[PDB]
Amino acid sequence: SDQEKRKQISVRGLAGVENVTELKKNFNRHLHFTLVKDRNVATPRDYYFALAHTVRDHLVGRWIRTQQHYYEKDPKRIYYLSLEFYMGRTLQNTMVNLALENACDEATYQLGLDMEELEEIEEDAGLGNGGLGRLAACFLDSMATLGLAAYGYGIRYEFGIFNQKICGGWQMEEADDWLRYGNPWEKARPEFTLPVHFYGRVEHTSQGAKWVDTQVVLAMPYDTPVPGYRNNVVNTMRLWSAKAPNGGYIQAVLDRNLAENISRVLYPNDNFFEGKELRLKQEYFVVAATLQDIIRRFKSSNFDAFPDKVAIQLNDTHPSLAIPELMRVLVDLERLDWDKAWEVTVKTCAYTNHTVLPEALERWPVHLLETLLPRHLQIIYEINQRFLNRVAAAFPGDVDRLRRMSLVEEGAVKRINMAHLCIAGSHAVNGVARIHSEILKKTIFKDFYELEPHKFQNKTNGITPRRWLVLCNPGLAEIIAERIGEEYISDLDQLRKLLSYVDDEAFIRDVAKVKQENKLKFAAYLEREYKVHINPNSLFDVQVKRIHEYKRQLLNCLHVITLYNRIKKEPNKFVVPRTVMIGGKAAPGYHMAKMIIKLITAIGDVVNHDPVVGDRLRVIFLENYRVSLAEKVIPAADLSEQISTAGTEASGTGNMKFMLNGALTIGTMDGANVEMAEEAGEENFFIFGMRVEDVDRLDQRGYNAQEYYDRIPELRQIIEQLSSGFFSPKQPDLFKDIVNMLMHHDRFKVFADYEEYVKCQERVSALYKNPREWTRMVIRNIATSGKFSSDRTIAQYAREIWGVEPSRQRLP
Amino acid sequence: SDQEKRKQISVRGLAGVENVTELKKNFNRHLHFTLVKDRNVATPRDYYFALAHTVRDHLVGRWIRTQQHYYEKDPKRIYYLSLEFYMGRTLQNTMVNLALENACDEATYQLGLDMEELEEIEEDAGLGNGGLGRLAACFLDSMATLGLAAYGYGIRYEFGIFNQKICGGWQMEEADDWLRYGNPWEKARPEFTLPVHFYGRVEHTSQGAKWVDTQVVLAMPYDTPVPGYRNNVVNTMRLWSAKAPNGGYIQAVLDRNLAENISRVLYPNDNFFEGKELRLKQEYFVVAATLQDIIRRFKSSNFDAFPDKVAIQLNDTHPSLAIPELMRVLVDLERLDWDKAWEVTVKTCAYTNHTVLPEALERWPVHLLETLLPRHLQIIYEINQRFLNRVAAAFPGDVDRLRRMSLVEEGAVKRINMAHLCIAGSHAVNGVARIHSEILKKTIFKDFYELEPHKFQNKTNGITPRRWLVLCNPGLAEIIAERIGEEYISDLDQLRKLLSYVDDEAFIRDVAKVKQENKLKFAAYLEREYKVHINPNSLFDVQVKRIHEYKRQLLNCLHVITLYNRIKKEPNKFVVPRTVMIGGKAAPGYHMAKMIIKLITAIGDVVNHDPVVGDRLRVIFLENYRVSLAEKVIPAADLSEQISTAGTEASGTGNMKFMLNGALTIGTMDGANVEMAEEAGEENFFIFGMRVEDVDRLDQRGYNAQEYYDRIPELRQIIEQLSSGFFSPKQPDLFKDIVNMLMHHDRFKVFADYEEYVKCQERVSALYKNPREWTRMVIRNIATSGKFSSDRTIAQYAREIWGVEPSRQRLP
Ligand SMILES: CC[n+]1c(C)c(C(=O)OC(C)C)c(-c2ccccc2Cl)c(C(=O)O)c1C(=O)O
Ligand SMILES: CC[n+]1c(C)c(C(=O)OC(C)C)c(-c2ccccc2Cl)c(C(=O)O)c1C(=O)O
Ligand SMILES: *Cc1c(COP(=O)(O)O)cnc(C)c1O
Ligand SMILES: *Cc1c(COP(=O)(O)O)cnc(C)c1O
Ligand SMILES: Cn1c(=O)c2c(ncn2C)n(C)c1=O
Ligand SMILES: Cn1c(=O)c2c(ncn2C)n(C)c1=O
């Protein structure tokens, strides 16, 4: 009796067995009881919510069963700490991974509703800036699919990356109020709310050190379920929210907003460091809370065993404070000896580097750290002293090496090099692509690689074949399925078997049919939502990614102006029709990126209205590029632009998405482009321009953009057009800053790759003129994209870093 | 087909038929699917939520059916506009009104859970300061129970009235974060979000006037269901939330908090005007949005008929801007002629006055109104000019009357008298108790009553017998039920039949048993939650209400010190044991009220620890008095303190709650005390002190507190104790401000009612010495409390103001 009567309370029976009858029944239940509405007044969004709740209900039993499982079994747990999780929409992905997509589709049909229309109501969970944030998301999905006891820990931003609008040809930012109508996926967990301390001071009592007189901010966790692919595994992504603890009474209540501002907005900086204190607060916030929850879970089924049960993976140096924080807790609170604590920390943490550009790396002024986190700065200084002590003993007399490896950067404003802190405190540091990992060992991390070679590894990036194929390209996924089955969805290497169809007329006809369907659908979407008309019988040339100087959208601009100038030159000469699409957001305070977006639209203003050009060349800027737009435009792309200056793009992932969806790649030998060309065969790729050693040689003697301007008539014509106001009649000097940078301050040598790029583009159109051959080369790409599935990347992290074994064994 | 297939989507079948089996089934469903939890990790609060969701599900079918009904039938709609709705908890009230209390109680029993424990997890929706806010709440409940198409419109405050804590004997305020774990009762309605304009300017174009260049703030409505008593009627309370519309990008996103601050906190001022701009914003916010929604509903099944379909009731002058706003919309937007629009407005609005104290009435400086609401000030000036024109024609030559009746108050700071605006723009102005309504006609509103006598009415306040008897006092409700049935719950006048039992030994034994049970329960609650020990065999003397000078808690203080001094004087003389309880909150910036709370605890510090006093007299301050605490302490009260200075308390409602729950009243002839004494018979009451005419006479010759001090030795002793530091040893002069006020600046003549009060208290204890006679007099009170049920008050408002007929006919 009594406590035995609570056995009734169980997950035992849910909404049935996963079919149409019960699904409709539950959709109805949610529409009336959850939305307190009826068919007469239900709005489309209401219907979207009804469906989402019905679908989420299917997650619960598995969600609870999975966490119970990890508790029972107690496997080593993997913690992915990141300040970004670019998740995009969840509805379709959840249905796909639970195998409910067809049933929901039928159920909503019989209820007279259109599921596709409803799925469009859901807005992106854009809690990320780009690559790094999307990778976290692909990683969550792969770890679930691989049966890993993995937890994604981040910040629940009230406002994700701003929604971009184009006004007058310029980018205008708008707050991304994504939680306005609520979030059907998350589940708050008040009982797990934790305190995070700021400021205060440090007093050294008999015992040890004490952090006193601090300002407290509470961290409330919100759980979102992450389902593996049909294995009945549902993992958790825990995002922390800032809550105030509990000039007059009124103002004091209004001021609660100050402490809760911590989790308000995602800093919109992609590959750029801004040392704003609010950002440092967000970083410590997610770290402190996350570590408390990790230790709690560790204590609930001494610290010697911590590394055997815990793996903390740092996505960049953003959550690097986890290293000194873990030490603070172990030494200050758990009273462990410094060295034993240090051993534990290094064995627990592993750091992932995502770039090599100096401006993108974190260097926090010490004054900011001493006022905001006094004891962390003290611990960092002690970590430094003991680390430098080791290099001094390993390289006696090498004082300059000491200076270069120090965690502290002397100068006008003393700063703390976060990347150095991570290497000292992690047992593994990794690059995200073979070429990037190698550059790390030879350049920026060279000193460290010499002191501890074992520490450095490579983990080439990936994307999940679920969201990035099955989800976004059902057509491609089905034709691939009719030939080789469905086992590829969680074994992408099987795509290899498609090579056997390179000469199959049916498959060749199918691949091209699917691509043109997607191109048709995307064109319909653009005209409906933006009243933008694009020629579906043109070659879709697409470059989507954040606007950057290093990504060289500018190089792409030079090419489209060349295409236009050549046409005007020889109007009656035939050219492969092209629809050049460029999309991506610019960080708010990044002037040049904002100038580039304006140049793109400026070019379009001329090109798209020239009667002699007509249907032959259209240049359009895809507004507000985000995960959901990527799922639409990438499957409709013919040519994938991946033209970053060699050695600047650590890896790239969009490149992989394009390859997996039937697009041929034109790019440099940079990041993962190198490994993609190796997998398909360079004969099936469109590699061009300088190689890393080539830019290095150019650097040694000096890059003089004037030389290329003096030597290339076609290039001179374009710059003259830009300078003279040909693309800005009403404001002639509008692009002077772009021209000036190109001519005298181009760190990315655009002019130096112009000629080879244009010629390589000629060969792309030459191949496009032959559909059959274009299609056959596409096949050889898709068939070799298998190594770029995040399941492979994750399996390597697991076995080579975390020390855990992946598994595709389903749960009941 | 197609649209005929959507007929399936219906409320048709819910969680069954309202019994234990299905209830458990649904509680379980909610615990797993709604809370994403299971029995192993479910927290008590989780269980509280599970139950609340299960119960709320029972509301939906009725909720939808009721609104559908009003749409179909299209009755005249009643809109209750108020800046406060003191709703307290909803769980029990919902169960009670739906007749699910027993089933839920059994269902939770079989699931091994304790419903009472779970109900305590829910916190108060304290969106009110006191009487005025509670009245709105009682009114919502009565209008539902009476089958009226009524809508409560207010502001969804993120923070209700602060939670009061006592530290060092003083009140400390804490933000009331009532939405922390969510609100299971409300349902947001994004699709009904509306824009509210501020600042800007007015330009007069050909057509008319235009309000341009304004700052916009969005108003998102949240619906809470309000169930009638077992009639299947569920009405709506719509509360608006502030949302920003859509120094750098980051700061701009953080600054969204400024516009959303509008609905952040409830101003904690009870009976006091503070002209803060943020308050004016809240007032316009609720008015603008509410009126847009009202006109929408009016247009969706010309304006001549507006008054026949709409009734806007102003709870005080807080939402008075509704008058100029309705004119603005009708003239500016709907282009109606001024006079036709004015006719419409007056016929639509009716104003309710709640006080007579000058400091509690609204007078907004014109400079504040011209910058924040330029066109409203213009419309107010035009309303004034035309109103003054009428009085001038009705009283030719009376220029001073013009000056006194003007909506504009000249002087250093020109201001707008809101009360005057309401009288000019309402077809009915009403007081809240017979004596109050009469004072209005003779004093403050005299000029207006002379110009338009038809306009002035009285509507004596009430409380709902559901929350205030059935809910809070099940014991009393049951014994009353076993004698006369249950029809009284919605026909309180039936309580009259209890007079027939005044000499029934069974009933007399029962009434006293129920009261002692409640006294026992309350004592248990106080010791458990506050480790406060109270003698259950003492007479519970209780004064709970907001701390005020006019409510005279100070007079009560003088009495308890007298009780203590008399005991010390004659230690071995027998005295009726008393537990004097005083509770209530002080507005943050109200010094004297804060000094009073400190004096109360100070007195307790001496009294409660004097060994010679022992169990004979205990003085305790009930911390954080709110609706839920009222439901606990009032049913356990023996003596109800209602001692405001005659003519200051417009009506009071707590007085009614005490009478309905078996407590005898000691009070002045003020507010509704007068009508309560009339109903029970003054022989069954404990009326004392000056009458209105007595304070007026004292005012004419001047109030000299020194006279009473010179003439009353016992009074002199107390003041000497206060001044000398007897109740504040460590800080001798701690209460000098209280003494000084009493001696020379007492607007409420405490000293003048001291003697009669003490003597009247003697007669209370004389009666308490005779349980049988005390109980019989209690019976005669409860049996005559029937006129004070809000159902009666509401029925009068309906028939005499709104022009609609109440009804107890159930819906299917
Ligand atoms: C006690 C062991 N855990 C387990 C079996 C969980 C569970 O049943 O979760 C289901 C409701 C999704 C889960 C958990 C525990 C308590 C409150 C809320 C959650 Cl969510 C966690 C966690 O940290 O999240 C566990 C852990 O490990 O400490
Ligand atoms: C179209 C007529 N109304 C009606 C039958 C309602 C209803 O079915 O409500 C149920 C979901 C609780 C209700 C309504 C209408 C549209 C969206 C949300 C609500 Cl809530 C209202 C309202 O203003 O609240 C109605 C009104 O009158 O305009
Ligand atoms: C994949 C992805 C990225 C990263 O793209 P790269 O071209 O590798 O820089 C950025 N944004 C979105 C929305 C993505 O889906
Ligand atoms: C009824 C009520 C009031 C009003 O009480 P009065 O004594 O009439 O001033 C104030 N506060 C609460 C919590 C109430 O329930
Ligand atoms: C110079 N600069 C910036 O100023 C910048 C930026 N991203 C954001 N900002 C503000 N990037 C990438 C950049 O190179
Ligand atoms: C003088 N005074 C105040 O100063 C006050 C108040 N309520 C709030 N405040 C700030 N009351 C009722 C009051 O009489």
Helix (H) or strand (E) holding A260: helix A256-260
Give the 3-state secondary structure of residue A28: helix
Cα A650 to chain centroid, rounded: 13
The number of distinct structural domains making up chain B is 2
Residue among B633, B667, B684, B674 nearest B651 (CA): B674
Solved with: X-ray
Cα B343 versus chain centre, distance: 32
In angstroms, the CA B571 to CA B588 distance is: 40
Q: Locate A431 and state its tokens.
A: 């690059």
CA–CA distance, A548 with A591 (Å, rounded to integer):
10
Say if CB A779 and CB A507 are below 8 A apart: yes
Give Cβ neighbours of residue B394 (< 8 Å, ≥ 6 apart).
Answer: B451
Q: How many helices (H) and strands (E) does chain A have?
A: 32, 25
User: Does one domain contain both B488 and B538?
Assistant: yes
Residues of chain A numbered 197-226 and touching chain B (CB < 8 Å): 223
Claim to verify: residue A592 and residue A451 sit in the same structural domain: no
> A401-412: buried (b, 16+ CB within 10 Å) or exposed (e) per residue?
bbeebbbbbeee
Query: Looking at residue B271, what DSSP letter applies?
Result: S
How many CB atoms are closer than 10 A to CB B118?
Answer: 21
d(CA B431, CA B443): 12
Report, in angstroms and rounded to the nearest whole number, the Rg of chain B calculated over CA atoms: 27
Residue A335 a catalytic site member: no
User: Do both B133 and B163 map to the same domain?
Assistant: yes
Same domain, A582 and A562: yes
Question: How would you label A341-376 residue by residue, b for 16+ Cβ within 10 Å and e otherwise?
Answer: bbbbbbbbbbbbbbbbbeebbbbbbbebbbebbbbb
Taking the C-alpha atoms of residue A553 and residue B126, their distance in angstroms, rounded to an integer, is 57
Is A254 within 8 Å of B261 when comparing Cβ atoms?
A: yes
Closest alpha carbon to A353 in A436, A452, A269, A443: A436
**Is residue A438 in a domain?**
yes
What SS3 class is residue A417?
strand
Closest CA to B218 of A173, A124, A180, A251: A180
- Per residue, the 3-state secondary structure of A115-126, as one string, reads HHHHHCCCCCEE
Contacts of A654 (CB under 8 A, 6+ apart): A131, A544, A545, A630, A634, A640, A642
DSSP codes of every residue in A712-735: -HHHHHHHHHHHHTTT-SSSTTTT
Radius of gyration of chain A (CA): 27
Task: Dig out the tokens for A496 from the structure.
Answer: 């290899």
CA–CA separation, A631 and A464 (whole Å): 12
Contact partners, residue B596, CB within 8 Å, separation at least 6? B547, B553, B554, B557, B586, B738
**Tokens 């971009």 appear where?**
A164
The single-letter code of the amino acid at B608 is: N
Name B195's bridge partners: B218
In a shared domain, residues A253 and A368: yes
Q: Which atom of ligand 2 is nearest to the CA of A41?
A: 16
* Closest C-alpha among B407, B326, B313, B315 to residue B369: B407
Q: Name the 3-class secondary structure at B498.
A: helix
Same domain for A454 and A577, yes or no, is no
Please give the Cα distance from B496 to B498 (Å, whole number). 5
Q: Which of A5, A33, A181, A590 to probe the B interface (max B CBs under 10 A)?
A: A33
Could you give the CA distance from residue B497 to residue A218 in angstroms, rounded to a whole number?
57
Domain contains B419: yes
B238 inside domain: yes
DSSP string, B5-73: GGGSSSSS--S-SSSHHHHHHHHHHHHHHTS---TTT--HHHHHHHHHHHHHHHHHHHHHHHHHHHHHH
Q: Which of A5, A42, A248 sits opposite B110 (nearest CB)?
A: A5
The answer to the question of residue A345 being in a domain is: yes
Shared domain for A774 and A673, answered yes or no, is: yes
Around A420, how many Cα atoms within 13 Å sit in the side-chain half-sphere? 25
A172 beta partners:
A165
Residue with tokens 């017979």: B434
B578 beta partners: B539, B617
Quick check: B464 and B142 in contact, CB under 8 A?
yes
Task: Collect all residues with Cβ–Cβ distance below 8 Å to B27 and sequence separation of at least 6.
Answer: A9, B50, B51, B54, B107, B108, B111
* Pair of tokens at residue A675: 């490994």
Q: State both tokens at A728.
A: 């800005």
Amino acid, res. A196: V
Secondary structure class of A217 (helix, strand, coil) = strand
Helix axes A751-768, A771-782, angle to 10 degrees: 110
> Of B353, B382, B383, B380, nearest to B366 (Cα)?
B380
Active site residue A354: yes
For residue A356, give the 3-state DSSP assignment.
coil
Please state the separation of Cα B289 from the chain's center in Å: 23
**Of residues A10, A249, A276, nearest to B39 (C-beta):** A10
Name the amino acid, one letter, at B398: D
Chain breaks in chain A (C to N over 2.5 A) after: 246, 301
- Going across the sheet that includes A408-409, the strands are A363-365, A415-417, A408-409
Counting from 1 in the atom list of ligand 5, the atom nearest the Cα of A268 is 8
Q: Is B21 on the interface with A (CB under 8 A)?
A: no
Cα(A649)–Cα(A456) distance, integer angstroms:
19
β-partners of residue B544 are: B583
3-state secondary structure B368-400: HHHHHCHHHHHHHHHHHHHHHHHHHHHCCCCHH
DSSP A465-501: TIIIIIIT-HHHHHHHHHHH-SGGGG-GGGGGGGGGG
Bridge partners for B617 per DSSP: B578
Question: Is B1 part of a structural domain of the chain?
Answer: no
* Angstrom distance (rounded) from CA A73 to CA A75: 6
Q: For residue A649, what is the DSSP state?
A: S
Taking a C-beta distance cutoff of 8 angstroms, is the pair A81, A286 a contact?
yes
Separation of alpha carbons A176 and B7, rounded Å? 36
HSE-up of A146 (CA within 13 Å, CB side)? 26
C-alpha separations of A445 from A347, A363, A638, B746 in Å? 20, 15, 38, 79
Angstrom distance (rounded) from CA B245 to CA B196 = 10
> Smallest Cα–Cα separation from A197: which of A284, A85, A139?
A284
The half-sphere exposure of B434 on its side-chain side, counting CA atoms within 13 A, is 10
β-sheet bridge partners, residue A578: A539, A617
Run of H or E residues at A527: helix A505-530
Q: Do B254 and B132 share a structural domain?
A: yes
Task: Please name which of A639, A704, A643, A685 lies closest in space to residue A668, comparing C-alpha atoms.
Answer: A643
Contact A475, A522 (CB under 8 A): no
Cα gap A254→A329, rounded to integer Å? 33
Residue type, A373: L
Q: B742 phi and psi, to 5 degrees?
A: -60, -45
Evaluate whether residue B631 is within a structural domain.
Answer: yes
Give the residue before each break in chain B, using a C-to-N cut-off of over 2.5 angstroms; say none if it is continuous: 246, 301
DSSP state, residue B463 = B
How far apart, in Å, are the Cα atoms of B249 and each of A172, A268, B255, B442, B524?
10, 9, 10, 59, 56
- Whether B501 and B445 share a structural domain: no
Q: Taking each helix axis as running N to C, give the angle between helix A374-394 and helix A338-348, from 0 to 180 degrees, rounded to the nearest 10.
A: 90
Contact B253, A159 (CB under 8 A): yes
Element (H, E) at B366: helix B366-372
As annotated, the binding site of B for AMP includes 38, 71, 296-301
Whole domain around residue B288: which residue ranges? 6-462+790-809
Alpha carbons A375 and A360: distance in angstroms, whole number? 26
Tell me the shortest Cα–Cα distance from A506 to chain B, in angstroms.
37
**Is the Cβ atom of A759 under 6 angstroms away from ligand 1?**
no
**Contact A690/A644 with Cβ under 8 angstroms?**
no
Token digits for B435?
A: 């004596």
d(CA B553, CA B545): 9
- Tokens 């790759």 label which residue? A753
For the record, the structure tokens of A338 come out as: 């410094």
Which residues 6+ apart lie within 8 Å of A29 measured at CB? none
The verdict on residue B729 lying in a domain is yes
A 10 A CB-CB count for A208 gives: 11
Residue A679 CB-half CA count within 13 A: 22
Cα separation values, B689 from A363, A458, B41, B555, B693, Å: 76, 90, 60, 12, 11
Give me the residues of B, 580-599, that contact A with CB < 8 A. 588-589
SS3 A141: helix
Separation CA A644–CA A757 (nearest Å): 12
Residue A233 has, within 13 A of its CA and on its CB side, a CA count of 22
CA distance B159 to B588: 15
Tokens coding A127: 């809690």
One domain for residues A448 and A581 = no
Q: How many Å from the N-terminal Cα to the C-terminal Cα in chain B?
A: 29
Pocket test for ligand 5, best of A354, A356, A590 (most atoms within 8 A of CB): A590
Task: Provide the token pair at A540.
Answer: 């879709």
- At B675, which amino acid appears? E
In-domain check, residue A1: no
Strands A408-409, A415-417: pairing kind: antiparallel
- On whether both B409 and B475 belong to a single domain, the answer is no
A355: Cα within 13 Å, side-chain hemisphere: 20
Q: Which residue type does A565 have?
A: N
Task: Answer yes or no: are the C-beta atoms of A304 and A343 closer than 8 Å.
Answer: no
Question: What are the CA-CA distances from residue A165 to residues A174, A600, B16 (Å)?
Answer: 7, 14, 50
Give the number of the atom of ligand 4 that is nearest the alpha carbon of residue B131.
Answer: 4
Rounded to the nearest angstrom, the minimum Cα separation between A46 and chain B is 10
**Cα separation of A199 and A201, whole Å?**
7
Question: What CATH number is associated with residue B120?
Answer: 3.40.50.2000
DSSP letter string, B655-683: HHHHHHTT-EEEE-S-TTHHHHHHHH-GG
In this structure, chain A runs to a length of 812
Asked whether residue B425 falls in the same domain as residue B497, the answer is no
- The residue among B13, B106, B2, B92 whose CA lies nearest residue B55 is B92
Sign of CA dihedral A519, A524, A530, A534: positive
Tokens of A590: 């990044």
Cα A371 to its chain centre, rounded Å, is 32
Asked if residues A229 and A97 have their Cβ atoms less than 8 Å apart, the reply is yes
Tell me how far apart the alpha carbons of residues B432 and B670 are, in angstroms, rounded to a whole number.
Answer: 12
Q: Is A33 on the interface with B (CB under 8 A)?
A: yes
Q: Look at B37 and A64 and tell me if their CB atoms are within 8 Å.
A: yes
> Is residue B502 within 8 Å of residue B782, measured between CB atoms?
no
C-alpha to C-alpha distance for A613 and A571, rounded to whole angstroms: 8
Instruction: Give, in order, the Cα–Cα distances in Å from B364 to each of B291, B361, B377, B410, B440.
Output: 21, 10, 11, 12, 21
Residues with CB under 6 A from ligand 6: B 269, 271-272, 359, 548, 587, 589-590
For the record, the structure tokens of A306 come out as 């911590």
